[PDB]
């Protein structure tokens, strides 16, 4: 029914800065009783949504007074004062004037922190996996910032693109870094055809890749 639109945050916010997050409604949420029925929620990485504000400007019980809401009848703003690492997550608005009570699609808050190079670790396939005929080589690239990162696999000095699956964590609520795992999966027999396996991480913190390798 009502479509709620949220603005993207173009830029990460350093701890201690304040930031405004906005949402808009296709219809006025100001009701005949003078109250404006707009909720804001925070969904922290991996958790259920937590109500921050209802009735456009009333803080939910227990919510930090760093959060405040304002707006007219169709444009709304959540102000987060003195942002903390733990404020990272997705902020959603919801209207409560017309059924069904639709949600916006969320605004992700990213925290800006000092650049950090990844700690890179490479692991050979386990003997348990090899007995089943499989061979996964795992590389962790942990606790880096900013999120942009490239991993390249090399086998006996040649780039390998197939059989690689990557996964990235959300931003950490404590230290504001990111991590990534890259797994190269081969058969045991393919694995046994080569000797040197290399994971190479390229990140803004150095012009030269961080290279971790082992020999089978």
């Amino acid at each position: 029914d009502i479509v709620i639109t949220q603005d993207e945050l173009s830029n990460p916010v350093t701890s201690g800065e304040s930031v405004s997050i906005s949402c808009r409604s296709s219809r006025s949420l100001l009701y005949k009783d003078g109250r404006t029925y707009l909720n804001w929620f925070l969904q922290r990485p991996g958790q259920s949504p937590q109500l921050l504000i209802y009735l456009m400007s009333t803080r939910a019980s227990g919510v930090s007074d760093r959060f405040s809401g304002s707006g007219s009848g169709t444009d709304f703003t959540l102000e987060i004062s003195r942002v903390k690492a733990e404020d990272v997550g997705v902020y959603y608005c919801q209207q409560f004037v017309e059924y069904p009570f639709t949600f916006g699609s969320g605004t992700k808050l990213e925290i800006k922190r000092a650049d950090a190079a990844p700690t890179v670790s490479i692991f050979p396939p386990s003997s348990e996996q090899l007995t089943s005929g499989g061979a996964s080589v795992v590389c962790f690239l942990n606790n880096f910032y900013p999120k942009d990162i490239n991993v390249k696999w090399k086998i006996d000095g040649s780039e390998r693109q197939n059989g690689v699956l990557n996964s990235w964590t959300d931003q950490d609520s404590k230290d504001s870094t990111y991590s990534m795992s890259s797994t190269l999966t081969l058969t045991k027999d393919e694995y046994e055809r080569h000797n040197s396996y290399t994971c190479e991480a390229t990140h803004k913190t150095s012009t030269s890749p961080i290279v971790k390798s082992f020999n089978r």
Binding site: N39, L55, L165, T169, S179
Partner: protein, 219 residues
């Protein structure tokens, strides 16, 4: 105190019904709220599904057509979601919540229950230890891990030393391929503590009633 807890199957086959239970704790379900179901899709869009109020009065999102029923069992302090004729598009995390007239939910949103709608077979993970190839810069930190391969459906829970190892852990989102998921978890500990002190990953997959411990032993 006052909280809400969802339960129900994590996997349902297409065309069958999805049933979930919300148990209200601390407080009687006869208090006058809109006892609500919300779901969150992969990609994180939220959808209001419907409510029950006053034990017997309901309203639903027209998006759900005639497929949804919410009911209540006052004697158990529970309300229920039944969503019929499911398809893969009903795969989501389902939440229950308590709404009041002003839109206030308080802290009353459930933890969420993942429901996957799929014809794929429940499969427990194989859990493989990730131990470092040889030695490296010691007197500092060592990273270990666990590869959790080939399970269905989500989720798995990974802990290290039964939860005693909590700092320095990264459990990565799973990746799905050929109806099986794979995920890894890393832990970083002082080189002084391993291998002299044991490190074990504990991997639970409730959907298949399986829990596995894998001790990480040096190569």
């Amino acid at each position: 105190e006052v909280k809400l807890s969802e339960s129900g199957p994590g996997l349902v086959k297409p065309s069958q019904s999805l049933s979930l239970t919300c148990t209200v704790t601390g407080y009687s379900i006869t208090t006058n709220y809109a006892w609500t179901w919300i779901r969150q899709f992969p990609g994180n869009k939220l959808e209001w599904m419907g409510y029950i109020r006053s034990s017997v009065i309901t309203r639903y999102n027209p998006s759900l057509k005639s497929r949804i029923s919410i009911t209540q069992d006052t004697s158990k302090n529970q309300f229920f979601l039944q969503l019929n004729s499911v398809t893969t598009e009903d795969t989501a995390t389902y939440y229950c919540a308590r709404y009041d007239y002003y839109g206030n939910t308080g802290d009353y949103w459930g933890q969420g229950t993942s429901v996957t709608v799929s014809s794929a077979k429940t499969t427990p993970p194989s859990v493989y230890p990730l131990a470092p190839g040889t030695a490296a810069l010691k007197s500092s930190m060592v990273t270990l891990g666990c590869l959790v391969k080939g399970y269905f459906p989500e989720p798995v829970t990974v802990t290290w030393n039964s939860g005693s190892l909590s700092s320095g852990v990264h459990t990565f989102p799973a990746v799905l391929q050929s109806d099986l998921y794979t995920l890894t978890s890393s832990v970083t500990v002082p080189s002084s503590t391993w291998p002299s002190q044991t490190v074990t990953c504990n991997v639970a997959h409730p959907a298949s009633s399986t829990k596995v411990d894998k001790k990480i032993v040096p190569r």
